[PDB]
Structures are given as structure tokens and as C-alpha cells.
Design a binder for these strands. Structure first.
Ligand SMILES: [Mg+2]
Ligand SMILES: [Zn+2]
Ligand SMILES: [Zn+2]
Ligand SMILES: [Zn+2]
Lengths: 557, 112, 171, 107, 84, 178, 97, 268
DNA sequence: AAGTACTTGA
RNA sequence: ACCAGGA
DNA sequence: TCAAGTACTTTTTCCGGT
């Protein structure tokens, strides 16, 4: 349970995407993040004021967080930072960077085309941020010279001077994490033949991006507040707190650090090397070497499954789990932890049909009812019932498992010394067993239907199978060759109503899929119904009487 | 418009050939969705998932990370109108039960 | 200064109070939270004006919990001090460092060094006093201070003041 | 409207947006042999007035964006000489309602 | 910006969703020891009370019906037809 | 949870420039001249001179005591004692800030009666001075047009010296002789 | 048990809006973070015990809200920040429509 | 793919079908505004048979000694003969039934009469007969005005869209178009009197019940029609087993907007 | 296995 | 991530 | 300049054992 916070509770109305300015990373950061070593204060097992908690989140479970005083199941993580010795490309933005270079002057930071080209003012007109950038690029890519004077908005005889700089633009190509250009030149009207080939540095691209005007970058996909192009190049790297990269700390003394933690220390180590090379006697090539290694780790940390093949492998042969990898579809954050979730108040067992159950009920094995719970609020209407269910305990059928006090702290009837002399108060919740007639969600996966999930009445019964009415077989697409089914128990009066009022089996009879019923009479009943209704078929009094008494709402006539 | 007409005719035939009957409206809606854009928008990551809907909603099918990186680069704003975003946000979606609001009227409460 | 300001507080009522004495409980809950309060944005919220016409509005029922949230729109008298504000107050305390002056709900402290040089501390007096050739400042005495700056602090606002410039000091 | 047998040289084609407000349309003779509008699958498209459009949007509380779209190059949008921003009312025979009207804005 | 009563244009009938959400809400409030506006005629299930409260049209709630543009129409559970 | 205002500006990400506050009449965002009442109408800032403020609270509390008794159906030294009783009746008590304020306002008010506070309000609100200066002129008692122009430095070129002295004269006369 | 994507769809089809929230929150994940009202991030150093809030970087000791999101979403956000992306959460609107 | 493509689509409080951008997909859900569950296949009688047999069924001519309603059909039968004012009403009636018949043949080119529409009228009449113990002997207490105008009124009450403006009002007229043809056909003067043999009270009950049922039949704003549609095409695809590519593969071909399709064909 | 996107030869 | 099974 | 090639992306219903 989380504690009371005086902060006003709200809902998220908008998600404003963007990029971190290095300045922000440094601002939000609670520590920097100097040593690759996790902890062990010279082997003295306690977190090192350098990597995981130089003020960040928490380990130990016991022992609170050093920044917020909260501790473990309250403390969200706290971000840190690593100041990189040299600028590095963000793997993700590597091609957007390439494309921005392709649109801008690699010397003055001005759009290669403007309001002076007709097709350009046409493309600039585009309202769509992505589509506009799309068009600007296809135009600007081929413009290989930053223009000084372009023909006037009337005649070609007089040329109007736009922005300055008459420099020739490189023909940029990717060389796996590196951007290498090829300027044609001029040399006696010809040349190329044989152009100048050199790699464009992260810092030079950074400086061109830094010089791209607000008006200009805003014409491209960018936003002067949330995403300036200069932010696609990493300077100050945010360090995610332990909650993101938890150590699977087996036994008492055995580390068990996360994959992200190691990959970080790799970056850390790769950074310290670089910084000392440039501070000390810089052997010039030794730097463009250690730089390319830091660029590698900062790239592979975010996305490991890069085109220019060499996958960063953990010492085991097994490759490193990237952050990109964490989020990627079905199994993994979005699709696996958010769109779908493992849930509590769920049960699953083998199904078997029953002709004695009602269409809308479901047979619930006692053991399952004795586990599954509803948190009922102590009200004057139910005070006496609930007091008996509590008296009954977690072991007897109509019983309860827990009593929740005003205080918020859970009473375990299984163990509490005061489990007998428990004395209920209005406003407490009693976590009672699942009882006959409670509404529950019954499901049979796949679940290609509204109908694959229907709300049923409970029916606590003996034996380990979920029991269902035979006519309800079809919507679920169930048979009893060994099919299992899922049951979900709502915890609120609000959700209970949703189920009973919208999802209930009877409501589901006539289906909108084909404007006709999705449940009918089947198997034995369909077979015997023909057999019963032939002209040849007559029934003697003795049996007629039983046939009659069997109809539960028979008029007695 | 004739594109829609054919698109339905064709979709309907796949269903009808198998013996199966699906009420008009269902096929109509799909057919219409593909069409309303001006052309034939595919039920792929290249079609519908490339529309101007919320970043989080779109990221929940096929291009996840790539979509989210672009959201950062363009400083996209999720409206938070879609189902998928509210699901991600652990909020009550503006779906059936949540398609309207409930308030207490002090006036009628003082009347009863 | 001393203003009348239009304000609004969001209140979350538990279902048990959806009885006819609702607006009544609501108005009172507002007075509890709001009145006697001290924010920095608005300063001292002293007295809620015109009780009979407090606007409760419609309360939205919060979905998973039963409760209803109301944005109680209202209007009240406030005290917000400012640097440069000349205030008339009464001495409350007195020490070797200076003296505190009660200006409405707030206290303004005058440093020994923010007073004229002639005015000097006297320990051997009941109560402790400040003595000029012509003036005597002590616990019950009234002073006109110029607020030099404020510090917004939790359930209060405190300020440093001066009586060194012209037309300031004992009144 | 200019009706041509086989082609219009890109030299001549560059003089089309030359004389505003006046507009010019190029139509390859070979397309016009059969009237597409006459086809089984082709419903009634109706070019709305500026006032009529204004009302459509008022009555449905729509931003121009929110309306279904007809491409500027659409065989029917061409037949009617639809201009960007112009709206068409489409009247189709419904198996559901008998008559149904959609609207499409130009691209 | 809030549509005036005289200019309302949504169904005069309550939706399946509205009714379900009202019964849910009331059961939740009744269960949270809220004041009940009906004579419980020996009732105990907060849902069954809510059903009774909706039947007697003594539910003090209002449905705020939002339109796709953002505007809204306020409808009382008292005024809403329950043919469902 | 705290209280909010009629000011709704959307400071998206761009935090600061949280400018200073003075007698350059640069008060807060909150204490600007163009305010907006809850009815939505633009209404200019309400500043009170102690005397004005004393009557306001008294009024509100007296009327609260009317409503509280209705719902329950089914000499300056002497003003201080009477006020301290009305506070026990209407306020939560725990609000020492209000008791302190009321004792202060009772002991520091220049104009005892509403009639008197009226004339002050008319005489002053005709100068076209910002509500702040207009209140400060009511709150601080000044003789030389200098005393005023010194203690209320914002006035500096806003009014004539003789004009101010004429106003200072009428305010002196209005003073309710305790 | 897994209440998966497909199951979510049937719930959406039913219009069981609260039931869905209860599965995804109460019955699983559900967590409480404090967000800053200026930079819509989980920056807030909520020393909820001393009622102290703060978001250094915004120097905001006031404009702070509390929100209920699935722990997996807190995680997602922290993960996107790790990769320099800002998933700024806002408790009011600005766009309309 | 289908679910992910349609999820955010639902009916808003303006009977309009919109996505999460509020862009209009359908102006009215399923072109009629009705909930699929509340629809049943009904026969639009008017549509077929001979132009000859149509007349025998529908036509009433009080100015012809043979084509008048026999006074065995209704009490007024005797005094109704040669009433020119009433014959204006019956000619209006018939001229509309002839209009309907043409329009129907334009919608349904092959002449298919069986179409799923809301409110099973056949059943309403059936029930009126057992409920009121309808005597297929005694003459009706109905007026021509009682029937002719009664039907003209019920029509005004079959509400789908509520707005007070031409756009929304014509929208309503259109949405209700087909139902009304069925309605006018099944409730024409000769049919009601000679076939159904209804009393005023029974006919009045038949009328209120069509209204009640129709209203019940309209979709509920909030209905997640996106998921519904997606699942209603999805689920059957799972039960799937000149020679053209068909079934699951052709479906994959369709949704993908496959450029290079397998069995291209033209039907000239 | 099937598309988009971009690069390469005539 | 693999392997083996169930509907 | 326009066709052909190359890069490189991308999926697949829910429930013991390394
Ligand atoms: Mg089976
Ligand atoms: Zn912490
Ligand atoms: Zn240049
Ligand atoms: Zn912040």
C-alpha cells in the first residue's frame, strides 16, 4: 500500500513528446556517475557514491532512498547523468541527422533552398510537419551549393542576394555510425574527377545544427522548445535509476547486476579512456579510435540489433538486451506489459458441461471460490452477515480471507491472533470468498468475439472443473476434450454492474455479428427434441407428470 | 466512391463464399475506413498505422520504438483521445461506459 | 496592498456526505482548508467574503472511487507583503540584533544595522529597548517600517525591514 | 478545357497556371470516349456552394480536416473540375436505409 | 461550451451504458454508506437499492453527454426515458 | 491541495522569468491591474486601506453569523473586545492570523465609520492612481507631499505636489477622532 | 493469468470501460507517481511525510500533481527518458478540437 | 490488424461514427443508425410480382363499384362510395406505393425482397390478432383517415437524428427511407382492412408498438463499433476452409491492398 | 514474401 | 532464448 | 532521366523443462 500524498490527484490529458536538452539532463539529475564500479565501498558491500546510488534510487529493500526519503515501494527511481568526453549520435536519429545535413549548408547552417525557389515555397506551405520535412528533403538533397545570389522574384537579369556563403556541399553517405561526405571541388572547371573524402565529426554536425535558425529548423520537423536538431546529438547522457536495471541479488553476498548496468559501465569505461587521452599526450589517431568505441557503446545500449551487423555481445557469446529491444512488440513493455497484463483475481481450470446448470451460471470448484475474493464494505445492511463470514474463516466455504481496517492495514484471518474476537466497523472492507450468484467474467481464449468473454452467475460446486451450460458452448467455441477456461472476479460495485448490466450471457443471445442468435439448442437436446416431437411419439401419465414437474416455472396445471 | 463499392463487393464475397453471413454495417465500416482518406489505405503498418492518430496508439502495433523516436524528433502531442493511450495510462477510456460524465446535482439532492 | 482576490479550491467529498446538508459541509470544508491559510502566490488568505453566495458548481463523480470533486469558486481578503511597501506596525520582540514588528498577520524584523546609527541597544531595561538621543523603541512601541525583502516560508511570510531612511521609525 | 488526341508537350504544359483567376483543364480525348459517371458503381456527386459547405461544417461541428476526402485527380473530381477545398455531397442507394449521403472535401 | 436545455439534441432516452454506469455508481455510493433516497423495502444489495432508486427516479445524478467537438449536453436521470 | 486563480496562462516548459516585485508598482502575476472575476468579466484590482479592510471583514463575519444562526434553526478598546467575540462565533478560532489581523486593523484604522470610509474612497478614486497607491494613501498618514511621495515612491511624477497636499488635507479632516 | 490484448478488445467491444481500468490497474500494475506541472516528468522528489515536494531543475516547490498510472507505464517512460526521449505528462489541455 | 485498424471508432452523441481524431468515418452508423442485434430479415412485399397483382393487393378506388372496400370490411363502407375527398387520400396513398415500388427496384436491381430491417411488423400484426381476438368476419371500426393519416403520423415519430435544421432533418428523412417503404407497404388501407382485419384499437396498438420498437432499435452513443466490426469479420475468417483466389488468401490480398494480385479478372 | 526506400546503370 | 506438450 | 537492383524492414491465437 502507498501512503497519503497532499498533492492534487489528476489524470493525464496530453503527452508532450520531445528530446532532452543536455542542460535539462544535468538539471533533473540527482547524481553524476563517475565510476563503472556498482558498489562495494572497497569490497565493503554497500552502494558506491559513483554508479548505482551516488544519491539515485535504492537497493537493500531495508534502508530508505538517499534523495526522497521514501524507500522501495514508493520511491520511483531517481535519474543521474554521465558527462560524455565527446559528442555522440543517438542511434535512432542517425538518419534524421543525415537528412538534416542534406537540407542545410554544412558551413553557414542555412536551408539550401528558400522562399526564392517556387517548388520550395510550395513545399514550405505544407501544414503536415512530417510531410513538409519529407518534401523539403527531396528538394534540398540535390542542392550541392549554398547560394549567395539567386534570380529575383521578377527577372533573371538582376540576381537578388539571399544569405551569404558560397560553399559546396558534401555528398553524404552512411558508413555504419559514421557520416562521410564527398565534395566534388572545382579545379580548372572539372574536378571531380577524384573528390575530397572525409568523415564529418559529431561536433562539426553539432555546430552546424547549433547554427540552424529557429525559423529554418521549425520549417523542418523540429520544435524550438521540445525538439531542436542539436538534441539528436548526445552530450550529457541520462543514467536510469535501479528500478529500470534491478540487480537480481541472489543469497546475501552475490551481486547479480542487470544487463543495462554492465552496458552502462562499458560506456563509463569507454568514456574515461577517451577523456584521459585528450587531457594527456593526445596521440591524435588514438582518440578517433576511443571516440568510435564510446559511440559504439552509446549506440548498442539503446539499440543492439543495428544494420552494420557487429552485435555487442555479453561475455558468454549471448548478445546484450538493448532498451529498444525491451520495448519491441508482443512480450515487452507496450504490447506485453501495457496492452496486456498478468492479473490477480483470476482462475483457470478444465471445463465440463452440465445440463443442470442455468444458461447464465458457471460451476465454480469450492477450492477456487475459497481462494478468489470480493472486498465487501461493512455497511449496516451486511454487518451481521460479514461478521459471520469472518467468524467462519478462510478454511470453511462461506468465509473470508482478510479484514481491511480504516487504518488501511490488512488483517490475515489465517494467522491473526484476534481472528475470533474481530470486531467489524462500518467502512471496513471484508475480503470474503466468491459466493453463489456473484457476477464473474468467464472466458475461452482465443477471444475473437465480444462473446468470448461473458458475465455469469457463480455456482460453488464440488470437483475441480468449471461447469457450463451446454447451449453457451458455441459463443466460446468450447468442447470438453480438455479445454480450460478463464475466470475473472470484479472487485467493485461499479465493475460488478458493468458485467451484470452489459456482458451477461442472456444479453449476449442475439448477436450483432449476423443479426441472429449465437446460442441455440445442441447435441443431446437437439437430437432428443426431434425424437420427442414426431406424431408417432406419445407419453403415458406417469412420465408426463415428471416431465411437467421438471419445468421449474410450470403453472401446476 | 466506386472504389469503395468494389472494395465491399470483394470483401463480402470472401465471407459469403465460405457460407458465412456478416451484417452489412461491419464490412461497410472497414471498407469506409480504408476509403475516407481519399485513396485505398491498407490494413498494414504502411497504411492505417501511418495516419495522424496518437503516437502511443500507433506505437502499440508494428513499429513501437521507431514511432516513439519520431514522436520525440517532431515533438508530437498525444491528444489522449484514443482507447490505447488510456489503456497505457491506466485511465478510464472514453468507451461506452466512459463516453460521458456523471455529476451530483445539489439541487435535486436537496429535493429528495 | 490588502486585497480582495477571486479564488477557487478543488474539494473531494466522500459519498457518505451526499445528504441535503451537502453545500453546508462543503462551504465549511472550504473555510477549514482556505481561511487562515498562507500561500506565497497569494499570501495570507484571511477571511472568505460573502458566505451566502459561495459557488459549489456541479461535482464530478470520480470513477473508481465513489467521491465527487467540486471546484468551489469563491472570493476572499488577502495580505501579500512586498519589498518597498511601507507598513505601520507594533514591536513584539527586541534583542541585540534588532526588533520584530507585527504587521497584520505577519512579522517584519529590523536589523540593528537597518536602523539609524544613534539608536543603540540597551540590555539593562525591562523589557529590552533601543535608545536614540531623542527616541526609545521597546516591546509595546509603534513603528513605521519599509519592507526591504520577503521570505515565503511554509505557513507564513517573513520580511526584513528598515527605519534608516527618511519618514521612517518610531511613530 | 483542352481536349488532345495523344499528348501536350511539357513546353505547352508550363503555360497552364499562367493566367489566374482563370483556370485551364487538360483532357486526353481517349479517356472521354466513355463517361465514367454513367457506370453502375458511380454515385451522384454534387459540388456544394461556399455557403452550403459552411453549413455542412456548422451542422456537424467539423473542422475541414474531419471530413472524408476526394483526391484532386479523382475521375469524378476531374469531371466536375473540383478545386482544392471544394466539397461534394455523395448520394448512394443504401441496402440498409435506401438512401445515404456522404461528403468528400477536395485535395 | 455547454449546450442550453432548450437547444439539446441528443436522445431523450438513456443509453445502455448510461444506465449501467448510473446503477454502478449508486451501488458504489450506497456501499460506501451514502444517504439512500428511496424507502428500502427490506433491501440490502446496494445494486438492488440503486435499481429501486432509478425506478422511483430519486437518483440525484446528471449525465454530461460530450460531443466530439468538446461541447456538452447535461441530462438528468430524472428526465431520462428508461425503455431499455 | 492549494487554491487557484482566474489567471490561466500556459507556461509550457518555459519556466521563469519570475520578475521581482516593488514600488516600481511591479507586483505579482497574481496582483496585476487587469484581473478577471469568476463571472468572466475583466475587473480592475481591489486594494484596501486598513479602515476599508476592517469594515469588509467585519461585514463578511457579521453576515456569516446571520447564516450560521439561520441554519441552526432546525470605542476602539471596546471594538476589540466585541470583534474577539464575533471571531469565536464565526471563525475556526485556530486561525490566529485573522485574530492578529483584526486586532491590528482595529488599532491601526484611520476611519471608524462606513460614511467616513466612503468619502476617502471617492476623494482618492478620482486621482487615477493605481489601487495600491490609492490604498497606501488611505493606510499611511502623511503631512508633507514629500512624506507621501517618499513612502509611496511610485507617485513620484503621477500627481502634483500641491494636488497631493490638498488630498492629504482632506484625509486629515476625515480622520475619526478616537 | 494473462488478461491479454485480445481480452482487452472484447472489453472495449462491450464498452466495459471501468471493468477494463480495474483489470489493468487494481487487479495488476497500478502505481502512484508525482509529476511536475512545468516539465511534465517524474522528476518530483516527493518527501511525502514532511509534505515537502520540489522539482529542482524547475525549482518548483508548488505546481506538482499526483497521478495513478500502471507501474509498467512508469517504467516505459523512465525507459524512453533513458534513450533521450521526453514523454512529458500533462494534466490539462492546450489543443481543444 | 483489423482490430488495431478499427479500435478507436465509436458512435458519438450526434449518431455520427468517428475515430480518435473525430474525423467522420460514417455520418450515421451502418447508413441507418440502427443496432445490428435489433434487425431481422423482412420481405418488402411491394418490390415484386406482376404490376397486375400489385394493383389487386394495394389499390382502393371508392369511385368504382367493384374496386371499393366492401362494406363487410368496415362500417363506413356503404357511406364511403363515391367520396371524392377521401379518394384524394387513397390516390395520394397509391401514388406513393407506386413511387416506393420504383425506388425499391432501383436499390435492389435483381428484385431481392428479403432484407434485414428493424421492427418485425409481421409479428406485431400477429400479436394484435391474438391480443385483440380479431374476428375475421365482423366489419372494422376504422376510417380511411384513421389508417391513411395514422401511418403518415407514425412516420414523423421514427426518430434517428434530432437536430432542428435542414441538413440534420434531411439526414433523418434519408436514414428512415427504406423502413418507411416497408411500413407503407405492410400498412396500406386495403392490406389493413381486408388482410389483417384490424379494429381501431388493434391498429392503434400496432402503431404504438412500431414506434416503441423502432426507437429501441437505434444504436447507443458509446457503442464501440470499430472493435465490433473488426471482430465481426475476424471471427468468421477463423472458421474458413472460373477459378479465382478466395477465402483467407484473397482476404489477406484485400486488406493488404496487394498491387500484384493473383487471379486478375474482368467481367464484360 | 512483400513491401518501402533508396541507389544505380542506360 | 531454446526445447517439449495442451486447446 | 527511368527501370532494375540493393538495403532492410516486418509478422505469426492463449495455457511443463534447460
Ligand atoms: Mg477441444
Ligand atoms: Zn527516491
Ligand atoms: Zn552557406
Ligand atoms: Zn520539473
Amino acid at each position: 500500500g502507498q501512503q497519503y500524498s497532499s498533492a492534487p490527484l489528476r489524470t493525464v490529458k496530453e503527452v508532450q513528446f520531445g528530446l532532452f536538452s543536455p542542460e535539462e539532463v544535468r538539471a533533473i539529475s540527482v547524481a553524476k556517475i563517475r565510476f563503472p564500479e556498482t558498489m562495494d565501498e572497497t569490497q565493503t558491500r554497500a552502494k558506491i557514491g559513483g554508479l548505482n546510488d551516488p544519491r539515485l534510487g535504492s537497493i537493500d529493500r531495508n534502508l530508505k532512498c538517499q534523495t526522497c526519503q521514501e524507500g522501495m515501494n514508493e520511491c520511483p527511481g531517481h535519474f543521474g547523468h554521465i558527462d560524455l568526453a565527446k559528442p555522440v549520435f543517438h542511434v535512432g536519429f542517425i538518419a534524421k541527422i543525415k537528412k538534416v545535413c542534406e537540407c542545410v549548408c554544412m558551413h553557414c547552417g542555412k536551408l539550401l533552398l528558400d522562399e526564392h525557389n517556387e517548388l520550395m515555397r510550395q513545399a514550405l506551405a505544407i501544414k503536415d510537419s512530417k510531410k513538409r520535412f519529407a518534401a523539403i528533403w527531396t528538394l534540398c538533397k540535390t542542392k550541392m551549393v549554398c547560394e549567395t545570389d539567386v534570380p529575383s522574384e521578377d527577372d533573371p537579369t538582376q540576381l537578388v542576394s539571399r544569405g551569404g556563403c558560397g560553399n559546396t556541399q558534401p555528398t553524404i553517405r552512411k558508413d555504419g555510425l559514421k557520416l562521410v561526405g564527398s565534395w566534388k571541388k572545382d579545379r580548372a572547371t572539372g574536378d571531380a574527377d577524384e573528390p575530397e573524402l572525409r568523415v564529418l565529426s559529431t561536433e562539426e554536425i553539432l555546430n552546424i545544427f547549433k547554427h540552424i535558425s529557429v525559423k529554418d529548423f521549425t520549417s523542418l520537423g523540429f520544435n524550438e522548445v521540445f525538439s531542436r536538431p542539436e538534441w539528436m546529438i548526445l552530450t550529457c547522457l541520462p543514467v536510469p535509476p535501479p528500478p529500470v536495471r534491478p540487480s537480481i541479488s541472489f543469497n546475501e553476498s552475490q551481486r547479480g547486476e542487470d544487463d543495462l548496468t554492465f552496458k552502462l559501465a562499458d560506456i563509463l569505461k569507454a568514456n574515461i579512456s577517451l577523456e584521459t587521452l585528450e587531457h594527456n599526450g593526445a596521440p591524435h589517431h588514438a582518440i578517433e579510435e576511443a571516440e568510435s568505441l564510446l559511440q559504439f557503446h552509446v549506440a548498442t545500449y539503446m539499440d543492439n540489433d543495428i544494420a552494420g551487423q557487429p552485435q555487442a555481445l555479453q561475455k558468454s557469446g549471448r548478445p546484450v538486451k538493448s532498451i529498444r529491444a525491451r520495448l519491441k512488440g508482443k512480450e515487452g513493455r507496450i504490447r506485453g506489459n501495457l496492452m496486456g497484463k498478468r492479473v490477480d483475481f483470476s482462475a483457470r481450470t478444465v471445463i465440463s458441461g452440465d445440463p443442470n446448470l442455468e444458461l447464465d451460471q458457471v460451476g465454480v470448484p469450492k477450492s477456487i471460490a475459497k481462494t478468489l475474493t470480493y472486498p465487501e464494505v461493512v455497511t449496516p445492511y451486511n454487518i451481521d452477515r460479514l461478521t459471520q463470514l469472518v467468524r467462519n474463516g478462510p478454511n470453511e466455504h462461506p468465509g473470508a480471507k482478510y479484514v481491511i481496517r480504516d487504518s488501511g492495514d490488512r488483517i490475515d484471518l489465517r494467522y491473526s491472533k484476534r481472528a475470533g474476537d474481530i470486531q467489524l466497523q462500518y467502512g471496513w472492507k471484508v475480503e470474503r470468498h466468491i459466493m453463489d450468484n456473484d457476477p464473474v467474467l468467464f472466458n475461452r481464449q482465443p477471444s475473437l468475439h465480444k462473446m468470448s468473454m461473458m458475465a455469469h452467475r457463480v455456482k460453488v460446486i464440488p470437483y475441480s472443473t468449471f461447469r457450463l451450460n451446454l447451449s453457451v458452448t458455441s459463443p466460446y467455441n468450447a468442447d470438453f476434450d480438455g479445454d480450460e477456461m478463464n475466470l475473472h472476479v470484479p472487485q467493485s460495485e461499479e465493475t460488478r454492474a458493468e458485467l451484470s448490466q452489459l456482458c451477461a450471457v442472456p444479453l449476449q443471445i442475439v448477436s450483432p455479428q449476423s443479426n441472429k442468435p449465437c446460442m441455440g439448442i445442441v447435441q443431446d437436446t437437439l437430437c432428443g427434441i426431434r425424437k420427442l416431437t414426431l406424431r408417432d411419439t406419445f407419453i403415458e401419465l406417469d412420465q408426463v407428470l415428471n416431465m411437467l414437474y421438471w419445468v421449474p416455472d410450470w403453472d401446476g396445471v | 466512391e466506386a472504389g469503395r463499392a468494389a472494395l465491399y463487393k470483394e470483401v463480402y464475397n470472401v465471407i459469403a463464399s465460405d457460407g458465412s453471413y456478416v451484417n452489412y454495417r461491419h464490412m461497410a465500416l472497414l471498407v469506409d475506413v480504408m476509403t475516407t482518406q481519399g485513396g485505398l489505405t491498407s490494413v498494414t503498418r504502411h497504411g492505417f498505422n501511418r495516419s495522424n492518430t496518437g503516437a502511443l496508439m500507433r506505437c502499440s502495433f508494428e513499429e513501437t520504438v521507431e514511432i516513439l523516436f519520431e514522436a520525440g524528433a517532431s515533438a508530437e502531442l498525444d491528444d489522449c483521445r484514443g482507447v490505447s493511450e488510456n489503456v497505457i495510462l491506466g485511465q478510464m477510456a472514453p468507451i461506452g461506459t466512459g463516453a460521458f460524465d456523471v455529476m451530483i446535482d445539489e439541487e435535486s439532492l436537496v429535493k429528495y | 496592498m490588502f486585497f480582495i482576490k477571486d479564488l477557487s479550491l478543488n474539494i473531494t467529498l466522500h459519498p457518505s456526505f451526499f445528504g441535503p446538508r451537502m453545500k453546508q459541509y462543503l462551504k465549511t470544508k472550504l473555510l477549514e482548508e482556505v481561511e487562515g491559510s498562507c500561500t506565497g502566490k497569494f499570501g495570507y488568505i484571511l477571511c472568505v467574503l460573502d458566505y451566502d453566495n459561495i459557488d459549489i458548481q456541479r461535482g464530478r463523480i470520480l470513477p473508481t472511487d465513489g467521491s465527487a470533486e467540486f471546484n468551489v469558486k469563491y472570493r476572499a481578503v488577502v495580505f501579500k507583503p512586498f519589498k518597498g511597501e511601507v507598513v505601520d506596525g507594533t514591536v513584539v520582540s527586541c534583542s541585540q540584533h534588532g526588533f520584530e514588528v507585527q504587521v497584520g498577520p505577519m512579522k517584519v524584523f529590523v536589523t540593528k544595522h537597518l536602523m539609524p546609527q544613534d539608536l543603540t541597544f540597551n540590555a539593562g531595561s525591562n523589557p529590552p529597548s533601543y535608545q536614540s538621543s531623542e527616541d526609545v523603541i521597546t516591546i509595546k512601541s509603534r513603528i513605521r517600517v519599509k519592507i526591504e525583502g520577503c521570505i515565503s516560508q511554509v505557513s507564513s511570510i517573513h520580511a526584513i525591514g528598515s527605519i534608516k531612511e527618511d519618514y521612517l521609525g518610531a511613530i | 478545357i483542352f481536349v488532345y488526341q495523344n499528348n501536350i508537350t511539357p513546353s505547352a504544359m508550363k503555360l497552364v497556371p499562367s493566367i489566374p483567376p482563370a483556370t485551364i483543364e487538360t483532357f486526353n480525348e481517349a479517356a472521354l470516349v466513355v463517361n465514367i459517371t454513367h457506370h453502375e458503381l458511380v454515385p451522384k456527386h454534387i459540388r456544394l456552394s461556399s455557403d452550403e459547405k459552411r453549413e455542412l461544417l456548422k451542422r456537424y461541428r467539423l473542422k475541414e480536416s474531419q471530413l472524408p476526402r476526394i483526391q484532386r485527380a479523382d475521375p469524378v473530381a476531374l469531371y466536375l473540375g473540383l478545386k482544392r477545398g471544394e466539397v461534394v455531397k455523395i448520394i448512394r442507394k443504401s441496402e440498409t436505409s435506401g438512401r445515404y449521403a456522404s461528403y468528400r472535401i477536395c485535395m | 461550451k455547454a449546450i442550453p436545455k432548450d437547444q439539446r439534441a441528443t436522445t431523450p432516452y438513456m443509453t445502455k451504458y448510461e444506465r449501467a454506469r448510473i446503477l454502478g455508481t449508486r451501488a458504489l455510493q450506497i456501499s460506501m454508506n451514502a444517504p439512500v433516497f428511496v424507502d428500502l423495502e427490506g433491501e440490502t444489495d446496494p445494486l438492488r437499492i440503486a435499481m429501486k432508486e432509478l425506478a422511483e427516479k430519486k437518483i440525484p445524478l446528471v449525465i454530461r453527454r460530450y460531443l466530439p467537438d468538446g461541447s456538452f449536453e447535461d441530462w438528468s436521470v430524472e428526465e431520462l426515458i428508461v425503455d431499455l | 491541495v492549494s487554491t487557484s486563480t482566474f489567471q490561466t496562462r500556459r507556461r509550457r516548459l518555459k519556466k521563469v522569468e519570475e520578475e521581482e516585485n516593488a514600488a516600481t508598482l511591479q507586483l505579482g502575476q497574481e496582483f496585476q491591474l487587469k484581473q478577471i472575476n469568476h463571472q468572466g468579466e475583466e475587473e480592475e484590482l481591489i486594494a484596501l486601506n486598513l479602515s476599508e479592510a476592517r469594515l469588509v471583514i467585519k461585514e463578511a463575519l457579521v453576515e456569516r453569523r446571520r447564516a450560521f444562526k439561520r441554519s441552526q434553526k432546525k470605542t476602539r478598546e471596546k471594538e476589540l473586545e466585541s470583534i474577539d467575540v464575533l471571531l469565536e462565533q464565526t471563525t475556526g478560532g485556530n486561525n490566529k492570523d485573522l485574530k492578529n489581523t483584526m486586532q491590528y486593523l482595529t488599532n491601526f484604522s484611520r476611519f471608524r465609520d462606513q460614511e467616513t470610509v466612503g468619502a476617502v474612497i471617492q476623494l482618492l478614486k478620482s486621482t487615477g492612481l493605481h489601487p495600491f497607491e490609492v490604498a497606501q494613501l488611505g493606510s499611511l498618514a502623511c503631512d508633507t507631499a514629500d512624506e507621501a511621495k517618499t513612502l509611496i515612491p511610485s507617485l513620484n511624477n503621477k500627481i502634483s505636489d500641491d494636488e497631493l497636499e490638498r488630498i492629504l488635507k482632506e484625509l486629515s479632516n476625515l480622520e475619526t477622532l478616537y | 493469468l494473462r488478461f491479454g490484448e485480445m481480452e482487452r478488445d472484447c472489453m472495449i467491444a462491450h464498452g466495459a470501460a471501468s471493468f477494463l481500468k480495474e483489470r489493468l490497474m487494481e487487479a495488476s500494475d497500478a502505481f502512484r507517481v508525482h509529476i511536475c506541472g512545468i516539465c511534465g516528468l517524474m522528476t518530483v522528489i516527493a518527501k511525502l511525510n514532511h509534505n515537502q515536494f520540489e522539482c529542482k531543475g524547475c525549482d518548483n516547490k508548488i505546481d506538482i500533481y499526483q497521478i495513478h498510472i500502471p507501474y509498467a507505464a512508469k517504467l516505459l517512460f523512465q525507459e524512453l527518458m533513458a534513450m533521450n526521449i521526453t514523454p512529458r505528462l500533462y494534466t490539462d489541455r492546450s489543443r481543444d478540437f | 490488424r483489423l482490430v488495431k485498424a478499427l479500435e478507436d471508432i465509436m458512435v458519438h452523441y450526434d449518431n455520427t461514427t468517428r475515430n480518435s481524431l473525430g474525423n467522420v468515418i460514417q455520418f450515421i452508423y451502418g447508413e441507418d443508425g440502427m443496432d445490428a442485434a435489433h434487425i431481422e430479415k423482412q420481405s418488402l412485399d411491394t418490390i415484386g410480382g406482376s404490376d397486375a397483382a400489385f394493383e389487386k393487393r394495394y389499390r382502393v378506388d371508392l369511385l368504382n363499384t367493384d374496386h371499393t372496400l366492401d362494406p363487410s370490411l368496415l362500417e363506413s363502407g356503404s357511406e364511403i362510395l363515391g367520396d371524392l375527398k377521401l379518394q384524394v387520400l387513397l390516390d395520394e396513398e397509391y401514388k406513393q406505393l407506386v413511387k416506393d415500388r420504383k425506388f425499391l427496384r432501383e436499390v435492389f436491381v435483381d428484385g431481392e425482397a428479403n432484407w434485414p430491417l428493424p421492427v418485425n411488423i409481421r409479428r406485431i400484426i400477429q400479436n394484435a390478432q391474438q391480443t385483440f381476438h380479431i374476428d375475421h368476419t365482423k366489419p372494422s371500426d376504422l376510417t380511411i383517415k384513421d389508417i391513411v393519416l395514422g401511418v403518415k403520423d407514425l412516420q414523423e415519430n421514427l426518430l434517428v437524428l434530432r437536430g432542428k435544421n435542414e441538413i440534420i432533418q434531411n439526414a433523418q428523412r434519408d436514414a428512415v427511407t427504406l423502413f418507411c417503404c416497408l411500413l407503407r407497404s405492410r400498412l396500406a388501407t386495403r392490406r389493413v382492412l381486408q388482410e389483417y382485419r384490424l379494429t381501431k384499437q388493434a391498429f392503434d396498438w400496432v402503431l404504438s408498438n412500431i414506434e416503441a420498437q423502432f426507437l429501441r432499435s437505434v444504436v447507443h452513443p458509446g457503442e464501440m463499433v470499430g472493435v465490433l466490426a473488426a471482430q465481426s469479420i475476424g471471427e468468421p475468417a477463423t472458421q474458413m476452409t472460373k477459378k479465382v483466389t478466395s477465402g483467407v488468401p484473397r482476404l489477406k490480398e484485400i486488406l493488404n491492398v496487394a498491387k500484384n494480385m493473383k487471379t486478375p479478372s474482368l467481367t464484360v
